[PDB]
Amino acid sequence: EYPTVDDIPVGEVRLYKIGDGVWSHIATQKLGDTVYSSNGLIVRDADELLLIDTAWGAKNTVALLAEIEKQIGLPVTRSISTHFHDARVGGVDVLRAAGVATYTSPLTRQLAEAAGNEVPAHSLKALSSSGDVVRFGPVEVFYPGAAHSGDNLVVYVPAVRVLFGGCAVHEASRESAGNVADANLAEWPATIKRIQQRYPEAEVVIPGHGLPGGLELLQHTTNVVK
Numbered sequence: 001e002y003p004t005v006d007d008i009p010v011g012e013v014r015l016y017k018i019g020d021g022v023w024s025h026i027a028t029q030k031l032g033d034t035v036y037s038s039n040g041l042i043v044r045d046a047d048e049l050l051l052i053d054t055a056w057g058a059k060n061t062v063a064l065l066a067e068i069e070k071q072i073g074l075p076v077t078r079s080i081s082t083h084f085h086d087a088r089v090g091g092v093d094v095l096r097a098a099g100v101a102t103y104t105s106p107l108t109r110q111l112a113e114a115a116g117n118e119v120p121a122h123s124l125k126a127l128s129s130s131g132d133v134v135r136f137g138p139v140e141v142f143y144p145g146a147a148h149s150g151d152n153l154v155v156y157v158p159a160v161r162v163l164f165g166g167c168a169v170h171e172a173s174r175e176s177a178g179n180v181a182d183a184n185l186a187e188w189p190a191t192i193k194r195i196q197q198r199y200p201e202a203e204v205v206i207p208g209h210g211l212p213g214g215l216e217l218l219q220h221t222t223n224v225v226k
């Protein structure tokens, strides 16, 4: 049932229910030749929603808000971007215009600014060193160390044991690491092991791109990176 690039045109967004009060959002973007599918997360907290990652640019992020209003009907009040690439902060200006309080790690804000990308408005201050973890509403945000990028974060929803790995985690079908220009290939396996050790009871693991799986995606990622 999980949507792929073939099911979603650029500019549309689908939601997919993952567990109680947890959905992923899936969108499509085209970079020159390449067409990607990309996942974020939505998590209910009382009568509001926490959003993890934009839908890759302003147009998709507008469609994301519309689809949330249509399907869920609760307001997105806060967001977290999991790394500095346009794929995850592109659209933060749409979120700000809709009144969302946008957050990420201080390092992500710095890298986004350096890259000329959109910059979330607020910093999650206790996330500075590999291993740092903070609670934020109904999730934990974990900085496990450098991997796909130096700043990449993962997000865990403890009530339902759902781990959003973002682009630090590859889907089962993926056999190459993608854009490695900001990656730390040497550190990535150790970063994965840190995720494994922290969330040994996770039931679903959602990669940055492609099909959700279980904890097996973590070791798979290490194998690919090598």
Ligand SMILES: [Zn+2]
Residues within 6 Å of the ligand: 083, 085, 087, 148, 149, 167, 179
């Ligand atoms: Zn990226």
